[PDB]
From a paper:
In Kinetoplastids in general and Leishmania in particular, three PRTases are involved in the recycling of purine bases by the salvage pathway: hypoxanthine-guanine PRTase (HGPRT) (EC 2.4.2.8), adenine PRTase (APRT) (EC 2.4.2.7) and xanthine PRTase (XPRT) (EC 2.4.2.22). However, the Δhgprt/Δxprt double mutant L. donovani strain has less than 5% of the wild-type capacity to infect macrophages, establishing HGPRT and XPRT as essential for purine acquisition, parasite viability and infectivity in the mouse model. Leishmania HGPRT is an α/β protein with the known PRTase type I fold. It is composed of two domains: a core domain containing the PRPP binding site, and a hood domain that binds the purine base substrate.
The N-terminal regions (residues 1–19), the active site flexible loops (residues 95–107 from chain A and 94–105 from chain B), and the C-terminal regions (residues 202–210) containing a glycosome target sequence, are absent from the model, since they could not be located by inspection of the experimental electron density maps. L. tarentolae HGPRT Loop III residues Asp129, Ser130, Ala131 and Thr133 interact with the GMP phosphate group. A flexible loop (loop II, residues 92–118), the function of which may be related to the formation of the transition state, comprises a region (residues 106–114) with good stereochemical and statistical values, which adopts different conformations in the two chains. In chain B, the polypeptide partially forms an α-helix (αL) similar to that in human HGPRT, while in chain A this helix is not observed and the polypeptide conformation resembles that found in T. cruzi HGPRT, Tritrichomonas foetus HGXPRT and E. coli HPRT. A loop (loop IV, residues 175–195) connects the β-strand β6 in the core domain to β8 in the hood-domain. This loop (IV) contains some of the residues that bind the base of GMP by hydrogen bonding with Val179 and Asp185 and by hydrophobic interaction with Phe178. An important contribution to the stabilization of GMP comes from Lys157 in strand β5, which makes two hydrogen bonds with the nitrogen base (atoms O6 and N7). Residues of the dimerization region are also involved in stabilizing the active site, particularly Arg191 (loop IV) and Lys66 (loop I), suggesting a structural explanation for the fact that Leishmania HGPRT has been found exclusively as a dimer in both the presence and the absence of GMP. Structural water molecules in each monomer (H2O1 and H2O18) stabilize the polar side chains of Thr37 and Tyr182 by hydrogen bonds that are found in a hydrophobic region formed by the Trp34, Val33, Phe71 and Phe78 side chains.
Author numbering:
A (entry chain A): 20 to 94, 108 to 202
B (entry chain B): 20 to 93, 106 to 201
The structure:
C-alpha cells in the first residue's frame, strides 16, 4: 500500500477481533430473546463504518444474532427509516477520537426511546477524548494516529484498502 | 438461514465471481489512468448493495483500482451526490436489477449531472423482468426472477446479514 507509513492492523487481525466481539454481543444479548421481529438493529454511521458494518453483520450471523440494518449520516442528514422505539439498537462506528460525534448521535438516538442503546467501535482512541461517553464494545484500542483503510479515508481516498494503515506524514 | 430458504450461491462463489469482475473492471479502465484524485467512484445503492459494495471495493483495491465511495438512498442526499459527479468516472453498484425501473431512474438522474463516464455493476441481474431498456455493464450473476435474501439483501428487512445468497420458495 504506497501511501501507508505502516500497517497498523491487518484484515485478518480485524476479522479475528470482530469475531470475538460478536461472540460477546451474542452472550450479552441472550436474555433479550431477540428474533426477526425484535432483532439487533445495527446503526451504520456513514461513510466510514460501512465496511466494518458489512463484516460485523456477518460475524453476528455466525453467532445466530438476528439483525436489521439502518444507515445514518450526520457529518443529521440521514436518519433511520424503521422506527426504533422499543427496539434494541447498536451504533456502529469505525473510529472514535474526541467522541463529540458519537456523543451527539447517542443523545439523538436516545430521544427515540429505544429498548436499549449500545455502541460498538472498531478503533477507539481514548487518549483523544474531549467528552465522556460509554463505548460498550471498543474492539481495538489504539494510540493517537491518523488511520486510513477498512472504510476510513484520507480526503475521501483509501477507504477500499483491506488493512488499517497509519497515513504517511504528508 | 430461515427454514423456507435454499442456497443459490455461497459466499465463496460470490467472492470468486466478484474478484473476476474486478479484474475486468481494472482492464476496462486502464486507458483512463485512474488516480486517487481521479478515481473510480462507486455509488452504493442502499440498502441492499452495502455488503456487495464493501466486498467489491476490496477486490478493486487488490487490482490497484483507486476508488471513492458515495451512498444513494432513493431529495437532499440524492441531490448532493448528483451535484458532485460532473466529469467524474462513476459506477452505480446495485444488488439486483429486475424491471430496471430503479436503475433507469438512478442512471438518468446521475447522467443529468454530466459525469465523465457512467457504468453499472449488478450482483444479480434478472433480465427476464425487464420493463425498460438499460445497459448493465457488469452483471456478475444472471438468474430467473426468484425472491432472494442474504449478502445485504432482505425479506421485510431481515436476513441481510446472511453470508450466502439464498432463494425463498413460493
Ligand atoms: N479516516 C480517519 N478518520 C478519523 C480518524 N480519527 C477520527 N476519525 C473520524 O473523524 C470524525 C471525528 O471524530 P470525533 O472527534 O468526534 O470522535 C469521525 O467521523 C471519525 O470517525 C482517523 O484516524 N482516520
Ligand atoms: N431483497 C430482494 N430485493 C429484490 C429482489 N428483487 C428485486 N428487489 C428489489 O427491487 C430492486 C430492483 O427493482 P427493479 O426496479 O429493477 O424492478 C432491487 O434493488 C431490490 O431492492 C429480491 O429478489 N430480493
Amino acid at each position: 500500500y504506497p501511501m501507508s507509513a505502516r500497517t497498523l492492523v491487518t484484515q485478518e487481525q480485524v476479522w479475528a477481533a470482530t469475531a470475538k466481539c460478536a461472540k460477546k454481543i451474542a452472550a450479552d444479548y441472550k436474555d433479550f430473546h431477540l428474533t426477526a421481529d425484535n432483532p439487533l438493529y445495527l446503526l451504520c454511521v456513514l461513510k466510514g463504518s460501512f465496511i466494518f458494518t458489512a463484516d460485523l453483520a456477518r460475524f453476528l450471523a455466525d453467532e445466530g444474532v438476528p439483525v436489521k440494518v439502518e444507515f445514518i449520516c450526520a457529518s443529521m442528514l440521514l436518519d433511520v427509516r424503521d422506527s426504533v422505539e422499543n427496539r434494541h439498537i447498536m451504533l456502529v462506528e469505525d473510529i472514535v477520537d474526541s467522541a463529540i460525534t458519537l456523543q451527539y448521535l447517542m443523545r439523538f438516538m436516545l430521544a427515540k426511546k429505544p429498548a436499549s442503546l449500545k455502541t460498538v467501535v472498531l478503533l477507539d482512541k481514548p487518549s483523544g477524548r474531549k467528552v465522556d461517553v460509554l463505548v460498550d464494545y471498543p474492539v481495538i484500542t489504539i494510540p493517537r494516529a491518523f488511520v486510513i483503510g477498512y472504510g476510513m479515508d484520507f480526503a475521501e481516498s483509501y477507504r477500499e484498502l483491506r488493512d488499517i494503515c497509519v497515513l504517511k506524514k504528508e
